[PDB]
């Protein structure tokens, strides 16, 4: 019996949830942006310790 509502609500659930997914992704690369583009360099050091 629930049928027509069930897809109705289903509609809403997905549209919102999809958007969150894509929105969440974006956000993630932002907060990671410093670590992703983070870049090291090596310079061996004079032997005395």
């Amino acid at each position: 019996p629930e049928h027509d509502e069930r897809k109705r609500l289903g509609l809403k659930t997905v549209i919102i949830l999809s958007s969150l997914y894509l929105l969440s992704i974006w956000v993630k690369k932002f907060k990671w942006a410093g670590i992703k583009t983070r870049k090291f360099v090596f310079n061996p050091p004079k032997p005395r310790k």
């Binding site: 410093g34 670590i35 310790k49």
Partner: protein, 431 residues
């Protein structure tokens, strides 16, 4: 009585002191270690160190002269100090060194004994002077790929790649008259120097301007020199500050003044009326800190600098501090501001009113270059005091709150956290 300023081609500036036992003369070139380039770095500190090589400094040692030199970022100075009466003994020895002589100091036995000592010089600094080392790299990353970045004393790299043909390449471009100012400090008159200056003829490369580069800029960034073999941890942090001759030049120096400067050892320091201090002291989060608002012609650096033997708890150290900085925008006590205005003045004094002529030179030379004249203490104070709280709450509101920072450091900084933490503490959660 109000500092003298007159130009006959050579802009001649002086500042009299009737209670000075000595005086000093010299030049200030309005182009410093930030008018250099990536691979000629340290050329300006190389020039300083031939100028004090035993050769030229033994000359002026029979004469009774002492020479002073320093390089900054926007500027560059060459000062000589002696008794006030031997005031021609200064001007002549200056004249010899900068228009007469050229290759007498530029020997292949001189220059390969100076460069083989400005190399040991910049190899004790980056080796054992971490607080400035950290402080220097802070510029390198905040002002990356831009004028201010180049360390004043120059990279050991671009400092073994430089011959005399390079000392000159910078000299003949940026050692001009239209980029210099002659200074008279201590115990001499304006009519003693500008007389003894128009006494001498000649003109070096007249009409010539020194050249320009892409104006400096700022970008939120880090650079970390971890070294777990060094007993402490040194960190310096900041935002895009305020330039010399910026509307908030003083507003910003007042802010620095509030949180100020700590030394966990001097019991005097432990009692300062600084709010932040309430936190830091509980567990002894650090050994010392200090703030600043470094101002340069094109851009500035408001932040602070700390050393600490406390490695597990650095993460709070940076936290308590950057949170305090938030108050400056949202909740600074007026009665804090007064203690600032008050203390700024005392500091700004011992800066400007020290009984040492050499300082009053660079101060004068740099300022009378950038804005033309100097600004009097009464002028400064008249500004400092005008400053309301709203002064400080709108300056932090643009400059401090939620803006990119610029961290750098070395020693045991594994505990020093990451960039999305630190940077995030620039704000506080609101409804």
């Amino acid at each position: 009585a109000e500092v003298t300023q007159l130009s006959n081609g050579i802009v001649v500036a002086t500042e009299h002191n009737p209670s000075a036992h000595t005086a000093s003369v010299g030049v200030v070139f309005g182009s410093g270690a930030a008018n250099e380039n990536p691979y000629n770095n340290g050329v300006s500190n190389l020039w300083k160190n031939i100028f004090l090589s035993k050769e030229n400094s033994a000359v002026a040692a029979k004469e009774g002269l002492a020479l002073s030199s320093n390089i900054s970022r926007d500027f560059q100075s060459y000062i000589v100090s002696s008794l006030p009466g031997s005031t021609d003994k200064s001007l002549d020895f200056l004249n010899q060194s900068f228009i007469q002589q050229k290759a007498n100091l530029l020997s292949s036995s001189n220059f390969e004994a100076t460069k083989k000592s400005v190399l040991k010089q910049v190899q004790d600094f980056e080796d054992n002077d971490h607080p400035n080392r950290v402080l220097e790299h802070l510029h390198s990353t905040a002002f990356q790929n831009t004028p201010l970045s180049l360390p004043t004393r120059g990279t050991l790299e671009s400092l073994e790649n430089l011959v005399v043909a390079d000392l000159e390449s910078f000299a003949n471009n940026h050692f001009l008259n239209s980029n210099a100012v002659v200074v008279g400090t201590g115990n001499i008159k304006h009519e003693d120097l500008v007389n003894s200056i128009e006494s001498k003829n000649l003109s070096l490369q007249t009409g010539t301007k020194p050249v320009l580069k892409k104006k400096a800029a700022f970008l939120g960034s880090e650079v970390r020199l971890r070294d777990d073999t060094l007993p402490k941890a040194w960190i310096s942090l900041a935002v895009e500050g305020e330039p010399v001759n910026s509307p908030n030049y003083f507003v910003a120096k007042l802010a620095a003044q509030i949180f100020g400067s700590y030394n966990a050892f001097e019991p005097a320091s432990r009692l300062q009326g600084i709010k932040l201090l309430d936190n830091i002291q509980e567990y002894q989060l650090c050994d010392n800190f200090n703030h600043f608002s470094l101002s340069y012609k094109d851009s500035g650096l408001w932040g602070f600098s700390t050393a600490t033997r406390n490695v597990t708890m650095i993460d709070d150290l940076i936290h308590f501090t950057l949170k305090q900085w938030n108050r400056l925008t949202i909740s600074v006590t007026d009665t804090e501001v007064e203690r600032a205005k008050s203390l700024l003045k005392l500091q700004l004094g011992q800066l400007y009113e020290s009984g040492n002529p050499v300082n009053d030179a660079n101060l004068l030379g740099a300022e009378v270059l950038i804005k033309g004249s100097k600004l009097s203490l009464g002028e400064a104070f008249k500004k400092i005091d005008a400053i309301t709280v709203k002064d400080v709450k709108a300056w932090a509101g643009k400059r401090l709150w939620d803006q990119d920072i610029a961290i750098a450091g070395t020693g045991q900084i594994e505990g020093l956290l990451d960039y999305m933490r630190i940077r995030s503490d620039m704000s506080m959660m609101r409804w």
